[PDB]
């Protein structure tokens, strides 16, 4: 669906920026930079779960040229990248579910598992 | 949560782009420009309904200044802006519901209802 590679790059970048902003606000609440607010937290978790469904589509074959932080490795090992992306989506969905209840230990664990998705994928598939 | 006002503008622009990509795909399928897949159409409608809740947060005071197509009018008439935005969130949700059926007439009308809200807002609050 992308007319040029730049548009696929822009799409996936835009989605991850949105993900980072919303995910970071949950982080702030759990790290103690701001008080935990259950209502805002659940909006952020819902946002991350919905946004997680977006960027995969932008990783079109060979779009490692130009203004992208995606590595060529993505398309060398695309099944592994896809496995990570699916796990991330599933993690984000579990965080959204956890945010609908009061149990803080369950939220905190769900958040950690989702955060590990980010780091694990970036380590292998994103420029430093 | 924006570190600088440019960030708020980039956030809302990024969201609108994602909305446009998904809504545009849906309209291509309704207008004969690419093959129709009801499952894809539905999940795009769910993307739009989730995304529709994202850009409002970026419309912070003073962010008519910067690299933006938002008009100063937004902040004079923010009640009206917010009424249009919530109505958009509502109509995007309604399109997502319609997309769970095979009632093509109802889907076409839901899609038009959502399109009208894009235009209605842009006509008042976005630069030409
Ligand atoms: C692979 C399965 C990934 C997962 C899971 C997550 N990210 Fe990521 N992200 C990935 C790549 C390959 C890229 C580069 C995209 C490009 O074309 O440049 C990114 C990029 C980001 C960015 C920067 C976006 C931008 O403005 O250019 C951010 C802020 C980011 N990613 C954050 C992020 C977070 C917080 C995640 C977990 C909640 C996360 N990503 C997961 C690959 C993958
Ligand atoms: C007001 C309540 C709006 C509704 C409803 C919709 N949009 Fe809009 N949009 C609006 C403004 C004020 C702006 C300018 C943002 C800025 O800071 O420049 C926009 C912008 C867009 C864009 C351009 C994004 C970019 O890359 O800069 C697109 C593609 C866009 N809007 C599309 C869009 C669609 C398809 C909508 C309905 C499904 C829709 N918007 C609704 C205000 C509002």
Q: CATH number for the domain including B71?
A: 1.20.120.10
Q: Which domain holds residue B46?
A: 1-128
Q: Are B26 and B45 in contact (CB under 8 A)?
A: yes
Q: Are A10 and A63 in contact (CB under 8 A)?
A: no
A16 touching B, CB under 8 A? no
Resolution in A: 1.3
Q: Are A40 and A98 in contact (CB under 8 A)?
A: no
Per-residue CA distances from A93 to A64, A77, B125, B126 (Å): 29, 25, 34, 34
Q: Which residues of A87-100 are buried (b: 16+ CB within 10 A; e: fewer)?
A: bbbebbbbbbebbe
B44 appears as a binding residue in the annotation = no
| CA-based radius of gyration for chain A | 15
Q: Is the CB of B49 under 6 A from ligand 2?
A: no
B19 touching A, CB under 8 A? no
A40 touching B, CB under 8 A? no
Our CA angle for B114, B116, B122, nearest 5°, is 110
Atom of ligand 1 nearest to the CA of A88: 5
Among residues A55, A39, A89, the alpha carbon closest in space to that of B14 is found at: A55
Q: Which long-range contacts (CB under 8 A, 24 or more apart) does A61-66 make?
A: A62/A5, A63/A5, A63/A8, A63/A9, A65/A5, A66/A5, A66/A6, A66/A9
Question: What is chain A written as a DSSP string?
Answer: --SSHHHHHHHHHHHHHHHHHHHHHHHHHHHTSS---HHHHHHHHHHHHHHTTSGGGG--TT--SSS--B-THHHHSHHHHHHHHHHHHHHHHHHHHHTTSS-HHHHHHHHHHHHHHHHHHHHHHB--
State how far the Cα of B95 lies from the Cα of B110, in Å rounded to an integer. Answer: 5
A47 touching B, CB under 8 A? yes
Q: Are the beta carbons of B1 and A25 separated by less than 8 Å?
A: yes
Domain count, chain A: 1
The protein residue with its alpha carbon nearest to ligand 1, atom 25, reads A13
Per-residue CA distances from B117 to A32, B6, B83, B86, B113 (Å): 39, 26, 11, 10, 7
Backbone angles phi, psi at A53, to 5 degrees: -80, -10
Cα of A16 to ligand 1 centre, how many Å? 5
Count of CB atoms within 10 A of residue B101's CB? 12
DSSP, collapsed to helix, strand or coil, labels residue B70 as: strand
Q: Are the beta carbons of B21 and A1 separated by less than 8 Å?
A: yes
Q: Are the beta carbons of B17 and A1 separated by less than 8 Å?
A: no
Atom of ligand 2 nearest to the CA of B125: 12
Q: Are A56 and A85 in contact (CB under 8 A)?
A: yes
For residue A10, the chain B residues in CB contact (below 8 A) are: 17
B69 appears as a binding residue in the annotation = yes
Q: Is the CB of A125 under 6 A from ligand 1?
A: yes
Shortest distance between the Cα of A43 and any Cα of chain B, in A, equals 10
Token pair for B121: 């807002």
Q: Which residue has the tokens 């769970």?
A: B100
DSSP, collapsed to helix, strand or coil, labels residue B113 as: helix
Element (H, E) at B87: helix B78-98
State how far the Cα of B78 lies from the Cα of A86, in Å rounded to an integer. Answer: 39
A114 appears as a binding residue in the annotation = no
């Amino acid at each position: 669906n992308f007319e040029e590679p730049a548009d696929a790059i822009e799409y996936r970048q835009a989605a991850f920026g949105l993900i980072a902003y919303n995910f970071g606000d949950m982080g702030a609440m759990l790290k103690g930079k701001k008080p935990f607010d259950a209502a805002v937290f659940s909006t952020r978790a819902d946002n991350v779960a919905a946004l997680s469904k977006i960027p995969h589509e932008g990783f079109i074959a060979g779009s490692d040229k130009g203004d992208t932080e995606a590595l060529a490795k993505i398309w060398q090992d695309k099944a592994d990248f896809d496995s990570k992306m699916t796990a991330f989506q599933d993690n984000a969905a579990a965080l959204a579910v956890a945010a609908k209840s009061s149990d803080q230990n369950n939220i905190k664990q769900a958040f950690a598992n989702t955060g590990k998705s980010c780091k694990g994928c970036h380590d292998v598939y994103k420029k430093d």
